[PDB]
Design a protein around this nucleic acid. Structure first.
Ligand SMILES: CC(C)C[C@H](N)C(=O)NS(=O)(=O)OC[C@H]1O[C@@H](n2cnc3c(N)ncnc32)[C@H](O)[C@@H]1O
Ligand SMILES: CC(C)C[C@H](N)C(=O)N[C@@H]1[C@H](O)[C@@H](CO)O[C@H]1n1cnc2c(N)ncnc21
Ligand SMILES: [Zn+2]
Length: 860
RNA sequence: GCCCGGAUGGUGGAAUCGGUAGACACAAGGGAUCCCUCGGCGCGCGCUGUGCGGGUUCAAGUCCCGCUCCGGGUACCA
């Protein structure tokens, strides 16, 4: 051990020890108690960023902590390799997406090894390899034969000049990011998986997930959006078909003055042949991007179709209107608009001058004033024929039962949740195992012809996929006849839905899962990911677990016991307009900035000489080009210093605006720990610690040692507040510096403390603590060492602080015995001059007393 | 727009069940790697202070109602 702390010599040497000895390689050991510490696998974009390092340090801190308790901890790492950014990068850099991805896997693997995350590298997966995606292709064909898969048409962003399907990210300002030509909706046939079949199970089992956070669970409820209502069919005068609409408020059905309809609905298509104005409005609605954000933000417009739907109860002819705000996907592509008691319909009715009929009385029991706004609340009915006087309960059921008796309506459970559309029409993805025969019949790819291997070695023009462009690739022979297999590929969420299960048996050749191995590890004890994946991924992840359960693969109903959704790591994001309107995103490192007096950014110029558009703070990513590479800080300060800084700066769940300020405290702290152990070990081996033969300062120091162990254990294990745990050890270390190491009992006590501190820091800074553990003559490696347990008799308090208050303001503070009555606390508090100052010439009205904590005195 | 969260000294943050506001660090100034000072306004004291406006309470950063700004998701970014 040198006097100076030099990471570059220590860290890589300890990293080699873990690889050669295979410290974090684990098997299904029935003797040890199991623990699955899963962190969400990354997309190999190129470099790591401080978002990644936060996620994986949190996981590694938990994984090393649970090992030291004495459990067989599985912390796996893999690569969610398929994706869009590979194709964009491959075309620009003149490569194929496969070798580009494998380079980025190789680079980031070495960056993860540098950071020293104790992963099981024998279980390493890559989702782009056919050894992985063969099983999901086999799984997909089974789901089709169960009837959970079905084909239907779906809206897609389509640049008509290129003849290519764009993503939501690839559209910007309602325009194509490559070329100058506007995007439009194209209805295209695609494969869907019935996630709505498991909607009630996904909704109900949130109540059993008590160790998941209410933030994530509440978002998933609202996303699913279960809804009990009524379907109501209408007749339309000069129109051969009928219009069904969904509604949760059939009580207000008598106030339905019109019917709003979506743009692509066949009634609007039929009306637009004759009507020239509606033809212009439908073609305007083609420009509407496939996104709910842009749908609600844009102005609510509409056109009268010409048709008149007959209202079943009243018998009145009401106008059917085409409108943008009505979604095609939710409901049935049409609604019963009650503008009197719906703020969205009120504005539509007031704009285009439609009738606003009131049918619900206000809470006072009177006719509501609908001059400024609609009455959204529920109440008694009026001006509603036979249904007058009924409250919401009776009004709902009476009109439902009437419409059920008439045979023009029925009760139905609806979900906001749509089915999982898995068809993508890009190259870099697992191909869908479906075959179109020469017959015309569509059936699954046979088991002998699985997997449908995606050819890695290809050349991409950028417009069209090579497997689509080449006519030879699609050819096959099924059931003794020519056939064309599906050139569309899976959604990338498909691969990341079941990877957690595959980690348990990743080299299992004989099936999708080795259930003996899977049921040992599963379910997952802690799942560490970003808050971004609260809904989309986690809902698929849960859904896919339930499918594997229903195929007899896994025991549990839920995949993960505990969820730790960490907050995003934010960074500044800049860009400039290119010559062909191309958004070239510039990094914060390259941006030259002039700031505001408050703190905000005002001007922004890149190194070359372009006026940068400052978008704002946003999540670190390859897309916005705002990720900060840890490699620079790791080289300078060391992985331990970077790792400690990430955990110390902010609590896991809260978001973090990134800045390097604060690292120097983490660096200096680790030098102080190194220094104190150097000074301690230099004096030689210590005496055996006599517990009941210490001074009061030694007893108080030992109290703080075991109290820190109690706090650090609680803060990590129960709370996951790592910032408070690391701060608690800094307090103890600051106290241990001032402690005099003269006598043998002082050094005996300094041994116990330093053994505890090095073990408590180990999950955060494992490289430095591996070295310090050996230097203190600890048994074996620190990785396998037992986690320190706090002694109850050491933490005993004889006295306690009591804060004296006068009208809720602190005037004095006093030390009192723990078993002291309220009379003794008042008499003791009265002796303080600042307390006696505000009690002269006034009557004590009330005396509140929190036992051994606080004493307020209300004064008159 | 809708759903979910956040805002505390120059800066990141602490206060775990309504009960000492600013632990622990950074940056800054001053002294000799170590020590001192450090929310604001006028002292070994007094008032005030947790984005903004009301309310409940003996007591609110914490609970309630109404805003402002900022982030995440919004179904083809992963
Ligand atoms: C299961 C699967 C669908 C996961 C998917 N393959 C994936 O997300 N891959 S990844 O490379 O983008 O990220 C890996 C982990 O890191 C988190 N993360 C990402 N960006 C940030 C950020 N700016 N700040 C904080 N965390 C971030 C992210 O949530 C995830 O847990
Ligand atoms: C008195 C009000 C509530 C009547 C309103 N015109 C309506 O029927 N709203 C529908 C349902 O009450 C509710 C179901 O959650 O959402 C409305 N709705 C149904 N389908 C759609 C759709 N496709 N687009 C927009 N809103 C819709
Ligand atoms: Zn284009």
């Amino acid at each position: 051990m040198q006097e100076q702390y030099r990471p570059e010599e220590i860290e890589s040497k300890v990293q080699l020890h873990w690889d050669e000895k295979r410290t974090f390689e684990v098997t299904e050991d029935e003797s040890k108690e199991k623990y699955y510490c899963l962190s969400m696998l990354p997309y190999p974009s190129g470099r790591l960023h401080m978002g990644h390092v936060r996620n994986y340090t949190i996981g590694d801190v938990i994984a090393r902590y649970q090992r030291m308790l004495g459990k067989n901890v599985l912390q796996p790492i893999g690569w969610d390799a398929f994706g869009l950014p590979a194709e964009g990068a491959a075309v620009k850099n003149n490569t194929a997406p496969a070798p580009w991805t494998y380079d980025n896997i190789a680079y980031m693997k070495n960056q993860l090894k540098m950071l020293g995350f104790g992963y099981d590298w024998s279980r390493e997966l890559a989702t782009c390899t056919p050894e992985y995606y063969r099983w999901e292709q086999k799984f997909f064909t089974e789901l089709y034969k169960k009837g959970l898969v079905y084909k239907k048409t779906s809206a897609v962003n389509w640049c008509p000049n290129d003849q290519t399907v764009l993503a939501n990210e690839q559209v910007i300002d309602g325009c194509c990011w490559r070329c100058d030509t506007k995007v439009e909706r194209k209805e295209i046939p695609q494969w869907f998986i019935k996630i709505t079949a498991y909607a009630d199970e996904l909704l109900n089992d949130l109540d059993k997930l008590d160790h998941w956070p209410d933030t994530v669970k509440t978002m998933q409820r609202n996303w699913i959006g279960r809804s009990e209502g009524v379907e109501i069919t209408f007749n339309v005068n000069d129109y051969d078909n009928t219009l069904t609409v969904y509604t949760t408020r059939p009580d207000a059905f008598m106030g339905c003055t019109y019917l709003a309809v979506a743009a692509g609905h066949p009634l609007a298509q039929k009306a637009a042949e004759n009507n020239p104005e509606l033809a212009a409005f439908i073609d305007e609605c083609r420009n509407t991007k496939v996104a709910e954000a842009e749908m609600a933000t844009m102005e609510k417009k509409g056109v009268d179709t010409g048709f008149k739907a007959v209202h079943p109860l009243t018998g009145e002819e009401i106008p059917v209107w085409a409108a943008n705000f009505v979604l095609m996907e939710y409901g049935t592509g049409a609604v019963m608009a009650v503008p009197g008691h719906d703020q969205r319909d009120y504005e539509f009715a007031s704009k285009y001058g439609l009738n606003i009929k009131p049918v619900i009385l206000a809470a006072d029991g009177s006719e509501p004033d609908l001059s400024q706004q609609a009455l959204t609340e529920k109440g008694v009915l009026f001006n509603s024929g036979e249904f007058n006087g009924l409250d919401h309960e009776a009004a709902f059921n009476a009109i439902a039962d009437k419409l059920t008796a008439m045979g023009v309506g029925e009760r139905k459970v609806n979900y906001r949740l749509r089915d999982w559309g898995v068809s993508r029409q890009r190259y870099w993805g697992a191909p869908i195992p479906m075959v179109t025969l020469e017959d015309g019949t569509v059936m699954p790819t046979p088991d002998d012809q699985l997997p449908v291997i995606l050819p890695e070695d290809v050349v991409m023009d950028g417009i069209t996929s090579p497997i689509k462009a080449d006519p030879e690739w699609a050819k096959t022979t099924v059931n003794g006849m020519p056939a064309l297999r599906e050139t569309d590929t899976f959604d990338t969420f498909m691969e990341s839905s079941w990877y957690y299960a595959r980690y348990t048996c990743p080299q299992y050749k004989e099936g999708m899962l080795d259930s003996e191995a899977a049921n040992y590890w599963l379910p997952v004890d802690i799942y560490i990911g970003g808050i971004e994946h609260a809904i989309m991924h986690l809902l698929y992840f849960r859904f896919f677990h339930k499918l594997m359960r229903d195929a007899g693969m896994v025991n549990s109903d839920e995949p993960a016991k505990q969820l730790l959704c960490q907050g995003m790591v934010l960074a500044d994001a800049f860009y400039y307009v290119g010559e062909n309107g191309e958004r070239n995103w510039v990094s914060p490192v390259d941006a030259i900035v002039e700031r505001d007096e408050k703190g905000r950014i005002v001007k922004a110029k890149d190194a070359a000489g372009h006026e940068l558009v400052y978008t704002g703070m946003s999540k670190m990513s390859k897309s916005k080009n705002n990720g900060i590479d840890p490699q620079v800080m790791v080289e300078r300060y060391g992985a331990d210093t970077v790792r400690l800084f990430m955990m110390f700066a902010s609590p896991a769940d809260m978001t973090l605006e990134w800045q390097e300020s604060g690292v120097e405290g983490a660096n200096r702290f680790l030098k102080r720990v190194w220094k104190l152990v150097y000074e301690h070990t230099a004096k030689g081996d210590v005496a055996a610690l006599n517990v009941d033969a210490l001074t009061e300062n030694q007893k108080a120091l030992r109290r703080d040692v075991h109290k820190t162990i109690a706090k650090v254990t609680d803060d990590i294990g129960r709370r996951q507040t790592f910032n408070t745990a690391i701060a608690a050890i800094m307090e103890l270390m600051n106290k241990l510096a001032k402690a005099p190491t003269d006598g043998e009992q002082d050094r005996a006590l300094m041994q116990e403390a330093l053994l505890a501190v090095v073990r408590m820091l180990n999950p955060f800074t494992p490289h430095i603590c591996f070295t310090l553990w050996q230097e203190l003559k600890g048994e074996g490696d620190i990785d396998n060492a037992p986690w320190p347990v706090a002694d109850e008799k050491a933490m005993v308090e004889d006295s306690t602080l009591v804060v004296v208050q006068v009208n809720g303001k602190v005037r004095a503070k006093i030390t009192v015995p723990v078993d002291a009555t309220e009379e003794q606390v008042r008499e003791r508090a009265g002796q303080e001059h600042l307390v006696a100052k505000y009690l002269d010439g006034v009557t004590v009205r009330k005396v509140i007393y929190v036992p051994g904590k606080l004493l307020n005195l209300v004064v008159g």
